[PDB]
Design a protein around this ligand. Structure first.
Ligand SMILES: [Mg+2]
Ligand SMILES: [Zn+2]
Lengths: 274, 288, 97, 97, 63, 109, 45, 375, 303
RNA sequence: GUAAUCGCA
């Protein structure tokens, strides 16, 4: 679950057999093995330098994984093998739908492209980041499915709004105000506010919150000219000059967390490009 | 090798209110890196004390949210601006401050009068903007706590608006583990990333968190100077008067052991149980 | 149900703040028989020099494991519904029938 | 500039997503991807034929992609190959979970 | 050792049996957690890494 | 064993009274002090480097307090260097010192 | 420029959002966005 | 005046005593709070000294290094030599963020070489030959610029031994007191000053009157007064006959007008503070990993003094407050324990009976795991 | 008013099972959870013990066979020896042996140990002899941490390696109850430790605390085992090459007035190399500085 | 090398 779309876990006992000729060439090139026989004996002896050479060999080599029920064109893909200590081939979770794979006993095959043209083809065409739409109707094939969907639904579900949150009518008679999303996330990490606890977040004149076409439930207009417009999910204070002074969104830490993580993913991608 | 060393691999100053530093701990056995990282994060986020404004006094403002003549912004706005001011101090207890800017000046900033102990970190912070000739006289109370967010001296007795104050100087902290293993031996490396608000450097925050954890884990080492067959023996077998027998039955006492556990005062408590009865049961028990 | 659960929790918190820590935690130490009022605690402190912490530690020293385990309902991390904590076996048996 | 985006960019650079970004950027300037693949293959074959001993731990295809990225004004490490400065010693390899 | 189709005696026979045995365990060994009156069969566990409790109760058993 | 040996104050007085052809190095040490325990290793290495050219002796300060007091012993890790010539002056070094400085001292003066 | 959602997110909503992200930012940015979303989802679950 | 221009918030502390490496002024038998059961269960593994003896402190250089490590701004005033050892000490002080602008380097005098004369019969030595640049410091060589910015002055009794150095340190103290600073006097009686109590008192009678804060140890307090120590000093129990808080009436004869707080420290196990209006004692931990090198307990006193100086200098107005003094004592005990742990970890254990370890120049040391072997 | 700890209960349910309960009553709001989780992670995984790691049998063909006169196979004997609790405080490998004869039951009491190692239970069932036979076996005792995988299966003949678990603490638990102090939200901490007899729960608590302190100490050391490391470093810096000894020269040694010195110290400029690398415009940039001092510092640097 | 039979997902 901690692999990237381009990386896949590969066991070492398989990699040493697949890339055996490459590690033999490595042992011959460096001053570690005189001949092919001594290099093969050293590889059989499981010397520590052999694993280092194996890692250095496959840092830029693509691996072609495939499944027995290859119904669609996404049955065979390409990943970057990462050396692991085990006997089970690790796979990224988001890529399971494509292979119709479940970890209930399924097995997969591995293929190593020898020629340079085959390596270029595997690295450019057959990678996962280049195939995110099914060839049937052009719909996203890699999406959160079972547990990530549950987490996202818990994040964006909401809060008890009506009789569930209060026992008596508030007529006889939310509280936290955060200037930045970072402050609210830090307060949630410090257990100051719960996940579903309502709060107010100040926004810098964007009005990107999707909501119903509903008029303000109540509008407060003072003598000096500043009128407060209370909506269902946000408060928009303005002045006599028809100038939007302040905007406060009423939400929970989950929605702001999802928005911030998506925005920061985009911004980190843009920054890492440079 | 065999000696734990730390080194600051990265450090930068994005602004006067934001700092970043990354640290390392090369020699670590398996299982120690995660525990050390969690403890250091908890210490950085909860055990580091900060200095901030906890109170305000606005004699001119008669409301929590209102527009004064030349302030040009709401009192709530100036309070939210005041709560974002970072301060550096080593205060013990509470103190007082004051800002007495009296002019049509465009901006009110770094005009707060502070005792020597307290200091400001960023002067460019914007408190308010006076658009008309007016006397801005606000009183401020500053406190230092180990992340005690809730502190109210008088609970708004006088014309004082309590300000929500977070005493956490460290903005964010995170840890990662890199496991390098050669054959049988496996070594782990801990990477600590610290973001501070400018009151202290990430290295000083690391040192303070380490000392706080040590002080937390010391008191455990402190030392102070110095100057059954009764279950099977039910009360039914022992010959007892009917009244005390029924009383013991009602008091959920069925075996001798139970009676023995019960004390004389407790036995006396049972309804209808006379003091002489305590004698009778004691005598019958001593007979055995 | 969440409203009534939170109301019972708040009532228990208020009772703990009012009666005191020793008197509140005295319900899970049946082997301690002494006055748990704040006046008696202050009198004992004036007489011997032991604050509320020392007397509370001495009280907990006479607590059974069995009782301790029950007291855990009062943990601040996972507070248990006081109504369920103080229910009777007759009412609990009616849950499944 | 977001304040807490250092580790994310660091991990993006270290993992190898830079290669995917560069591949997308170089495919955004090509009509047919198959001819681009064939051209990259031919250039890598020429690079290998020119210097055999140079490669073996450094990939000629990554070298071609890095040269094409550097010639476009974007600085990229030669063949996208980086070493871990925090390595403990010889024979010690990191375990990537 | 339970024969299948215990619901021939009554309704929710398996549920009654399971809840009754859990209560007894909770009373005899005084582990209040085994039977929670609010959510029978579910308990609230903690995280080994951080030490913070989880929000919702989880099913604890020995299959 | 160790070339440096524990000697009483009386034999030290006898050695300083009688003539000698080798420099006399006297180390005041106490079991309790930590630095002195290290200094002993430097003294042993110096005695190894100078097998018969110099003589290295040590005296316990706790057992002989008056003798150290009259010799102006201000601190525990102190070393007294006595030149062979009865006309030259003594050298007192206070605190833990490098072995190279001790070699330079015993060579030059 | 991204919208702010104050409603429950489901599988169809996630598929719509992923399709729109693929259309706007391309597959390259969508890969990293999806990885971060998966990480946050697993963490919250 | 550069006061408003560049003085800075942490007020500067000035150390005047001396710069030396691993120096111990004196040592007296003392007692320690330890778990005797855990010691007897691990007698083979742990290093426990047969007779426990601790030192009042180290040198002013170690105090400055500790105070700088605690975050405070320290300045070291003194004189060294142009030899390699003096330059190494200066580099060690500078790398630890200690201001050495007031450190003077002269080639004509050596750093730690004290030429002395044989003297008359009976082993009576004399130091009239030549000082060691640690007792040599002219009054004109005092840097007044440091004393102007300094709001605290720290010196020790080891300096007052030499008549010229005593006059120099008295001039420095009076100049600081006239330029408005509180004098911290850490009395650490060297080995020769333990002969007679009256002579030791008269020797330190020029001190003890120009200082505001004085730190004394329990043994030194008993020596200065008429109290004779009556303890077993080696029994494996804490019987409340040690670590005893003396009554204020015993402290009263040695009190003076300018005195504000007096500290009595029996290691890091218990520190007693005495004030004109109140008196109390705070206990602390002293059961720490001890090696033969760390048996002296020198770093503990340095850490205690550094923590006390840091806490007092930050809020000078609260020097007489009870709660602030209690916090200061707790912080000092914590700093002493931390410094003892750091010295035990930095300097390991001597090699055991089987010593086949690679040796550094004139030294060889192993770790705690290496020392805990079967043979 | 203070910070105190005490042992609530001490229960020796068996010679290989112990119970202890401790209370940290006057603890503040956020310290309780941190202390609890740290103590839990320390007691489980950061405490080390001693166990049998190697067994040498005299005349057995393999470890999956039966020997006449013993009710248990070699594998059962190895599994029984695997659960032998020992107590030791020194690292390294030691040798033990078992020399029993005649019909009976061989237990942990028959084991002869070095003076440093001791047995706790002393009555554990190693094997059962139903005939007069001479039972001689060799044992290697080692002290480590965690669990050890029996990697050298192919090794010297006649010796079989048994995997060992060096975890003395069986289980641990903590609970945080409130103190009811009003505004100051103080809480009470409780700790339950289950050991196996090698060490008492109080000793386990103290060892876990000391291990946590040892782990957190290195952060207070200087940034990267001899008392003369600084002298050697300075000698190497001055002797090896120029532009490195320049780093060892600080502003302190360079004679400067108080104003410029303090301003450069506030500007995080300590060594002469930092002063040389910094530009004159950057020197003028700092507050409370003028062009006059620039000529002074340049002249005294040229000098 | 071919069959038979079972399993796998
Ligand atoms: Mg399947
Ligand atoms: Zn059923």
């Amino acid at each position: 679950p901690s692999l990237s779309l381009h990386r896949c876990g590969l066991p070492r006992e398989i990699a040493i057999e697949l890339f055996q000729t490459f590690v033999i060439r490595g042992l011959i090139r460096q001053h570690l093995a005189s001949n092919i026989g001594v290099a093969k004996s050293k590889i059989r002896e499981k010397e520590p330098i052999v694993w280092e050479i194996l890692q250095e060999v496959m840092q830029g080599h693509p691996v072609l994984l495939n499944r027995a029920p290859t119904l669609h064109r996404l049955g065979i893909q390409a990943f970057q093998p990462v050396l692991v200590e085990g006997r089970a081939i690790c796979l990224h979770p988001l890529v399971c739908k494509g292979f119709n794979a479940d970890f209930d006993g399924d097995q997969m095959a591995v293929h190593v492209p020898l020629s340079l043209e085959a390596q270029v083809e595997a690295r450019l065409l057959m990678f996962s980041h280049m195939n995110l739409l099914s060839p049937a109707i052009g719909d996203p094939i890699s999406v959160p499915t079972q547990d990530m969907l549950i987490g996202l639904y818990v994040l964006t579900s909401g809060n008890h709004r009506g009789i569930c949150v209060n026992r008596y009518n508030p007529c006889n008679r939310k509280e936290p105000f955060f200037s930045n999303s970072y402050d609210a996330i830090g307060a949630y990490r410090q257990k100051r506010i719960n996940l579903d606890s309502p709060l107010w977040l100040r926004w810098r004149l964007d009005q990107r919150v999707i909501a119903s076409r509903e008029t303000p439930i109540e509008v407060h207009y003072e003598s000096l000219g500043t009128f407060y417009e209370i909506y269902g999910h946000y408060l928009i204070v303005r002045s006599l000059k028809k100038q939007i002074l302040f905007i406060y969104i009423r939400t929970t830490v989950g929605h702001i967390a999802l928005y911030r993580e998506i925005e920061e993913a985009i911004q980190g991608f843009s920054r890492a490009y440079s | 090798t065999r000696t734990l060393q730390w080194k600051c691999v990265e450090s930068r100053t994005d602004s006067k209110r934001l700092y970043y530093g990354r640290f390392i701990l090369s020699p670590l056995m398996k299982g120690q890196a995660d525990t050390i990282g969690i403890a250091m994060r908890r210490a950085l986020l909860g055990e580091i004390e900060g200095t901030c404004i906890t109170r305000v006094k606005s004699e001119k403002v008669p409301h929590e949210y209102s527009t004064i003549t030349g302030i040009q912004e709401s009192v709530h706005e100036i309070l939210m601006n005041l709560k974002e001011i970072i301060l550096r101090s080593n205060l013990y207890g509470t103190s007082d401050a004051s800002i007495c800017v009296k002019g049509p000046g465009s901006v009110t900033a770094q005009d707060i009068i502070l005792p020597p102990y307290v200091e400001i970190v960023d002067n460019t912070q914007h408190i308010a903007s006076l658009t008309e000739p007016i006397d801005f006289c606000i009183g401020l109370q500053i406190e230092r706590n180990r992340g005690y967010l809730i502190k109210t001296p008088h609970n708004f007795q006088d014309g004082s608006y309590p300000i929500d104050a977070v005493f956490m100087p460290v903005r964010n902290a995170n840890h990662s583990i890199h496991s390098y293993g050669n054959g049988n031996e496996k070594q782990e490396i801990l990477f600590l990333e610290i973001w501070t608000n400018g009151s202290l450097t990430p290295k000083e925050a690391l040192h303070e968190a380490s000392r706080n954890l040590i002080d937390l884990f010391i008191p455990f080492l402190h030392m102070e100077e110095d100057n059954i067959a009764l279950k099977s023996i039910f009360i039914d077998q022992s010959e007892l008067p009917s009244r005390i027998y029924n009383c013991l039955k009602m008091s959920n006492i069925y075996t001798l052991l139970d009676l023995l556990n019960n004390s004389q005062e407790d036995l006396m408590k049972i309804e209808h149980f006379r003091s002489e009865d305590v004698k009778r049961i004691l005598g019958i028990l001593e007979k055995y | 149900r969440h409203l009534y659960k939170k109301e019972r929790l708040q009532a228990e918190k208020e009772k703990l703040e009012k009666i005191g820590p020793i008197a509140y935690y005295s319900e899970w130490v049946q082997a301690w028989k002494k006055d748990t009022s704040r006046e008696a605690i202050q009198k004992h402190f004036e007489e011997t020099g032991e604050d509320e912490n020392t007397q509370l530690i001495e009280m907990f020293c006479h607590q059974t494991d069995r009782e301790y385990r029950i007291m855990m309902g009062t943990d601040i991390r996972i507070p248990r519904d006081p109504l369920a904590m103080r229910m009777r076996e007759d009412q609990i048996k009616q849950i499944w029938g | 500039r977001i304040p807490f985006l250092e580790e994310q960019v660091r991990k993006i650079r270290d993992g190898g997503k830079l290669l995917t970004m560069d591949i997308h950027r170089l495919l955004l300037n090509e009509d047919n991807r198959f001819d681009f693949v064939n051209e990259i293959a031919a250039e890598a074959k020429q690079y290998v034929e020119n210097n055999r001993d140079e490669y073996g731990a450094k990939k000629a295809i990554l070298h071609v992609l890095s040269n094409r990225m550097n010639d476009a004004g974007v600085y990229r490490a030669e063949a996208y190959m980086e070493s871990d400065p925090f390595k403990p010693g010889p024979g010690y390899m990191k375990d990537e979970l | 050792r339970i024969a299948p189709f215990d619901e021939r005696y009554e309704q929710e026979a398996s549920r009654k049996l399971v809840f009754s045995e859990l209560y007894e365990a909770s009373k005899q060994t005084a582990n209040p957690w085994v039977f929670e009156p609010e959510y029978p069969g579910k308990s609230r566990i903690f995280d080994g890494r951080t030490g913070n409790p989880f929000e919702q109760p989880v099913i604890i058993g020995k299959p | 064993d160790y070339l440096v040996k524990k000697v009483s104050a009386k034999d030290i007085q006898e050695l300083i009274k009688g003539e000698r052809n080798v420099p006399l190095i006297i180390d005041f040490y106490a079991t309790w002090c930590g630095p002195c325990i290290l200094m002993a290793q430097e003294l042993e290495m110096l005695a190894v480097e100078y097998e018969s050219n110099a003589l290295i002796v040590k005296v316990d300060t706790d057992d002989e307090y008056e003798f150290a007091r009259d010799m102006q012993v201000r601190g525990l890790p102190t070393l007294y260097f006595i030149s062979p010539d009865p006309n030259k002056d003594a050298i007192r070094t206070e605190g833990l010192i490098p072995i190279q400085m001790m070699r330079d001292i015993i060579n030059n003066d | 420029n991204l919208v702010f959602h104050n409603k429950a997110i489901n599988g169809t909503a996630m598929k719509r959002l992923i399709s729109r992200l693929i259309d706007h930012f391309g597959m390259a940015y969508t890969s990293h966005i999806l990885d971060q979303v998966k990480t946050l989802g697993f963490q919250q679950a | 005046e550069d006061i408003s221009f560049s003085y800075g918030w942490p007020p500067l502390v000035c150390c005047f005593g001396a710069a030396q490496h691993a120096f111990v002024p004196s040592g007296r038998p003392s007692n320690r709070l330890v778990d005797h059961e855990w010691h007897e269960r691990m007698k083979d593994a742990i290093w426990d000294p047969e007779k426990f003896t601790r030192a009042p402190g180290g040198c002013s250089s170690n105090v400055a290094v500790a105070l700088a490590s605690l975050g405070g701004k320290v300045a070291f005033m003194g004189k060294l030599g142009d030899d390699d050892f003096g330059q190494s000490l200066v580099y060690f002080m500078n790398i630890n963020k200690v201001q050495t602008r007031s450190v003077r380097l002269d080639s004509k005098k050596a750093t730690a070489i004290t030429h002395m004369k044989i003297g008359k019969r009976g082993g009576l030595r004399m130091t009239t030959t030549k000082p060691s640049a640690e007792d040599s410091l002219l009054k004109s060589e005092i840097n007044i610029d440091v004393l102007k910015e300094a709001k605290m002055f720290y010196f020790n009794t080891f300096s007052m031994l030499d008549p010229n150095m005593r006059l120099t340190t008295l001039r420095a103290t009076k100049i600081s007191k006239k330029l408005g600073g509180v004098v911290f006097y850490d009395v650490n009686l060297p080995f020769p000053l333990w002969e007679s109590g009256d002579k030791a008192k008269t020797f330190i009678q020029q001190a003890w009157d120009l200082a505001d804060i004085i730190e004394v140890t329990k043994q030194e307090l008993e020596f200065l007064c008429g109290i004779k120590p009556s303890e077993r000093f080696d029994t494996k129990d804490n019987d409340r006959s040690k670590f005893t808080h003396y009554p204020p009436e015993v402290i009263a004869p040695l009190w003076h007008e300018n005195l504000k707080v007096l500290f009595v420290t029996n290691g890091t196990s218990k520190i007693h503070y005495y004030t004109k209006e109140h008196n109390s004692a705070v206990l602390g931990l002293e059961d720490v990993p001890l090696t033969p090198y760390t048996s002296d307990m020198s770093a503990s006193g340095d850490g205690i003094i550094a923590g006390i100086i840091r806490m007092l200098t930050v809020q000078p107005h609260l020097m007489t407050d009870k709660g602030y003094l209690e916090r200061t004592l707790k912080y000092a005990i914590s700093c002493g324990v931390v410094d003892q742990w750091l010295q035990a970890r930095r300097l390991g254990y001597p090699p055991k009976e089987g010593m086949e370890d690679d040796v550094v120049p004139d030294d060889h040391g192993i770790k705690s795991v290496t020392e805990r072997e079967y043979r």
